[PDB]
Amino acid sequence: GPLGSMEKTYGKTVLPLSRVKRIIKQDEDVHYCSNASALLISVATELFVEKLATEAYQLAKLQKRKGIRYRDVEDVVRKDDQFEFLSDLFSI
Amino acid sequence: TSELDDLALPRSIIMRLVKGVLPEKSLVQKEALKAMINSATLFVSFLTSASGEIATNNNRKILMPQDVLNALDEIEYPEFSKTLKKHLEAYELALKEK
Numbered sequence: 481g482p483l484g485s486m487e488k489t490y491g492k493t494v495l496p497l498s499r500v501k502r503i504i505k506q507d508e509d510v511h512y513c514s515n516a517s518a519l520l521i522s523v524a525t526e527l528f529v530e531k532l533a534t535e536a537y538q539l540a541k542l543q544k545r546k547g548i549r550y551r552d553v554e555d556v557v558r559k560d561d562q563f564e565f566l567s568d569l570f571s572i
Numbered sequence: 573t574s575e576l577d578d579l580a581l582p583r584s585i586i587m588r589l590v591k592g593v594l595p596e597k598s599l600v601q602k603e604a605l606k607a608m609i610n611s612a613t614l615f616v617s618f619l620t621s622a623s624g625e626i627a628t629n630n631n632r633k634i635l636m637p638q639d640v641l642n643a644l645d646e647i648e649y650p651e652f653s654k655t656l657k658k659h660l661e662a663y664e665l666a667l668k669e670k
Contacts, residue, residue, distance in 0.1 A: 491662030494585055503579050503616040510624040511633035516663060520640040521619055523659050525581075526589055527652050528615040532608055533590040537598065546595070550603035553611075562648060565618045566611050 493522035500525065535560060580609050622646045 481487055493500070497515075500522045504513045513521075536552040557563040557570045586609045590600055620635075622643035627635045637660050644653050 489662075490659050491664075491666050492659075494589070495581060496585075499579075499581055500616060503613055504620050506579070507617065507620050507624055509628065510620065510635055511627075513620065513624075513635040514637070516637045516660065517623065517635050517640050519663055520637050520656050520660060521616060521623070523656060524619055524640070524644070524649070524652050525612050525616050527655060528649075529586060529589040529608060529612050530593045532611055533600075534593050536604070536608075537594055546597070547599035547601065548590070548594075548604045549601060550607055553604050553607045557611075563611075565647075566614060569610060569614055570607070 491519070493519060494526060495522045497522060532556065532563070535563075576610050576613060579613050581612055583609060586612060618647060619643055619649075 497518060501513070501518050504510065504518060504521065532553065533548065535556045536548045539552045539555050540546070540548050554570050554572070557566045558572050583605065587600065587605060590605065590608060591598065594600075619640065623639040624635050626639040626642050626646070627633070630639075632639075641653060641656055641660075644650050644656070
């Protein structure tokens with residue numbers, strides 16, 4: 481609603497599903513990922529990006545900065561258990 | 573890798589997600605946005621793999637929505653569960669309609 485509060489439409493992702501499925505299809509062990517599953521994986525990925533951005537911004541804020549730098553993202557992966565799966569990508 | 577770059581989700585859609593949780597006029601530099609685009613790709617793979625395991629452990633070939641929801645516990649992102657369940661309910665509801 482325009483003159484009302486923000487209303488989210490659930491059951492949809494802002495990501496291009498074909499591109500998410502392309503990544504999903506790289507998994508050697510998966511026989512078939514259903515469309516409903518792909519959609520949930522897509523939304524989870526949205527939530528992941530938001531989580532990572534938020535944590536990286538919080539570190540920027542402690543250093544009195546208004547923007548995210550690469551070292552902020554890296555320090556998040558370096559220090560936070562939930563981001564352990566990224567440890568190789570950041571070569572830490 | 574050229575593989576990461578080929579798989580990467582659109583830089584502008586990821587940028588909007590990032591800026592969506594930051595104060596107005598916050599900036600995000602190139603090396604950082606890139607790192608998060610690539611992190612998103614690894615997250616898709618991470619959640620997918622854990623979900624496929626649960627499908628397999630249930631002797632199923634189809635990776636199903638409940639496998640993704642249960643995979644959140646295995647990858648220790650249970651804070652996403654309530655939101656995903658809401659999407660699933662809405663998804664199925666729209667499906668019958670459409």
